[PDB]
Amino acid sequence: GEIQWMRPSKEVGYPIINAPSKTKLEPSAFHYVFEGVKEPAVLTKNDPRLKTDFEEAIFSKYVGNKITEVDEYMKEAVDHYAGQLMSLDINTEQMCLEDAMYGTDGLEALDLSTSAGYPYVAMGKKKRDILNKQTRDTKEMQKLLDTYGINLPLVTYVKDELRSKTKVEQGKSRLIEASSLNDSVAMRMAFGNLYAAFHKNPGVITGSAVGCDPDLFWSKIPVLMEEKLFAFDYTGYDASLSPAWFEALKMVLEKIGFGDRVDYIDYLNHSHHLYKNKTYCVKGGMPSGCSGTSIFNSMINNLIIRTLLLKTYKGIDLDHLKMIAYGDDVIASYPHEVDASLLAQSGKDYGLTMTPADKSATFETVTWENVTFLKRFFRADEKYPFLIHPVMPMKEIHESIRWTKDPRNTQDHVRSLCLLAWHNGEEEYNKFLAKIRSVPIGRALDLPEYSTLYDRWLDSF
Numbered sequence: 315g316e317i318q319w320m321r322p323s324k325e326v327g328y329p330i331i332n333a334p335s336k337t338k339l340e341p342s343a344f345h346y347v348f349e350g351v352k353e354p355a356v357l358t359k360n361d362p363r364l365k366t367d368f369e370e371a372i373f374s375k376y377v378g379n380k381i382t383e384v385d386e387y388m389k390e391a392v393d394h395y396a397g398q399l400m401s402l403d404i405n406t407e408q409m410c411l412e413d414a415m416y417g418t419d420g421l422e423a424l425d426l427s428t429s430a431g432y433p434y435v436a437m438g439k440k441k442r443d444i445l446n447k448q449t450r451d452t453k454e455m456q457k458l459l460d461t462y463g464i465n466l467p468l469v470t471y472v473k474d475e476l477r478s479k480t481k482v483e484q485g486k487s488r489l490i491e492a493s494s495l496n497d498s499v500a501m502r503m504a505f506g507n508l509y510a511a512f513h514k515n516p517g518v519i520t521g522s523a524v525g526c527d528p529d530l531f532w533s534k535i536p537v538l539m540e541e542k543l544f545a546f547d548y549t550g551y552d553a554s555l556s557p558a559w560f561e562a563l564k565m566v567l568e569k570i571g572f573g574d575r576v577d578y579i580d581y582l583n584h585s586h587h588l589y590k591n592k593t594y595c596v597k598g599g600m601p602s603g604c605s606g607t608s609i610f611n612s613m614i615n616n617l618i619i620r621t622l623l624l625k626t627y628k629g630i631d632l633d634h635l636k637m638i639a640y641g642d643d644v645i646a647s648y649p650h651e652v653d654a655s656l657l658a659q660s661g662k663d664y665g666l667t668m669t670p671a672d673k674s675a676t677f678e679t680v681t682w683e684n685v686t687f688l689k690r691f692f693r694a695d696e697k698y699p700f701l702i703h704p705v706m707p708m709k710e711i712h713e714s715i716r717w718t719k720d721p722r723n724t725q726d727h728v729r730s731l732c733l734l735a736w737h738n739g740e741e742e743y744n745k746f747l748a749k750i751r752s753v754p755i756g757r758a759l760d761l762p763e764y765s766t767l768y769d770r771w772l773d774s775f
């Protein structure tokens with residue numbers, strides 16, 4: 315990805331976008347009961363913690379577009395992946411405005427908490443207005459579409475969340491490139507059924523894990539994988555994507571019946587952005603907050619791994635590449651070992667920066683013992699080994715519980731963490747409950763006991 319030009323939004327007729335300058339994150343009732351070194355991310359240029367320019371930092375993720383055309387390898391990658399997706403009989407039809415708005419099987423209703431985007435964020439109009447669950451009315455939306463059309467600018471916000479001390483000092487704050495409600499609705503009508511097919515089929519056929527339920531999916535993963543596992547992390551995956559990767563994605567879409575709307579992909583690739591008082595244009599880069607960002611990122615990842623394998627190992631049998639991606643995160647396997655380090659070298663030629671899995675210093679062998687997917691490890695249940703526990707490290711849970719945004723969501727926030735925590739074992743879980751109950755707020759929460767979670771889990775398969 316690369317910014318082509320950035321200039322004052324007033325110069326081109328665009329209103330300044332107001333974005334809070336104060337984090338909504340504050341120490342929680344458990345701030346001193348657990349250990350943690352993370353803090354809220356910088357939201358403005360004036361933050362005293364900054365040790366470098368904020369603007370240069372937030373936009374440095376756009377490292378450039380390393381490649382131009384779609385080469386032979388990418389093309390074969392496209393053919394093979396499109397091939398697998400073909401076996402799903404994905405309904406190529408357009409999704410009706412109603413289902414796209416309020417949901418249907420395989421697709422959840424639009425989230426009312428996320429920004430409505432332009433021009434609404436300038437008008438003031440919000441989502442709770444335009445639509446409402448009960449009536450499942452399209453009228454207002456259906457009207458607003460004709461009123462403002464599509465291909466509307468993306469409102470860029472700094473993501474209010476926790477970041478390491480380094481990310482704070484280097485101004486490495488993540489951005490939320492918000493999609494207009496209109497576009498979000500259009501794209502969901504355009505690809506609605508595709509999204510549903512993926513959500514309903516997480517695995518090695520879609521090579522996607524989007525919409526999955528870790529408590530149940532983790533037991534299926536090991537079986538779907540080939541003998542030898544391999545993985546690696548990406549640095550700035552989204553922002554690093556070059557236009558050619560979007561064209562490759564369009565080729566896949568065309569081959570499975572969505573050629574009549576690949577135009578949408580062009581806006582993800584060549585996009586118009588609004589941030590604060592400035593406006594900018596980006597060539598390449600997957601925007602973080604559009605409808606389908608995850609799924610399209612996962613699809614592109616399926617193309618990238620295939621490509622690197624074809625360019626590094628002529629003769630490789632893709633039919634035996636078993637991989638599952640979630641955006642840039644991925645768990646892959648092959649019957650034979652492969653040099654991740656070498657693959658990373660090839661990745662650099664495609665504009666991708668790949669490094670050892672889980673911040674390792676060097677590329678080492680990936681095992682069922684050290685492999686993670688979505689930050690969770692895989693651990694067979696001590697009593698019934700065929701059931702696999704997705705294990706989120708307690709450190710992550712500790713970092714999170716130490717802060718709050720809304721005291722009203724303390725119950726849900728803590729309950730949610732408990733659903734992640736218990737997989738670490740009964741002992742660890744009770745120590746976690748004990749610390750939570752060591753202060754008034756915790757003692758008042760309705761928290762599930764271990765036995766209850768475990769038995770429920772056992773019965774869920």
Ligand SMILES: Nc1nc2c(ncn2[C@@H]2O[C@H](COP(=O)(O)OP(=O)(O)OP(=O)(O)O)[C@@H](O)[C@H]2O)c(=O)[nH]1
Pocket residue numbers: 473486488489490491548549550551552553602641642
């Ligand atoms: N900008 C942005 N990225 C998001 C969001 N949600 C998930 N991501 C993903 O998070 C990535 C950014 O991660 P960072 O922590 O900044 O760093 P990194 O890319 O993992 O690279 P490292 O510095 O090596 O850890 C993007 O490339 C996306 O894949 C979001 O709301 N905004």
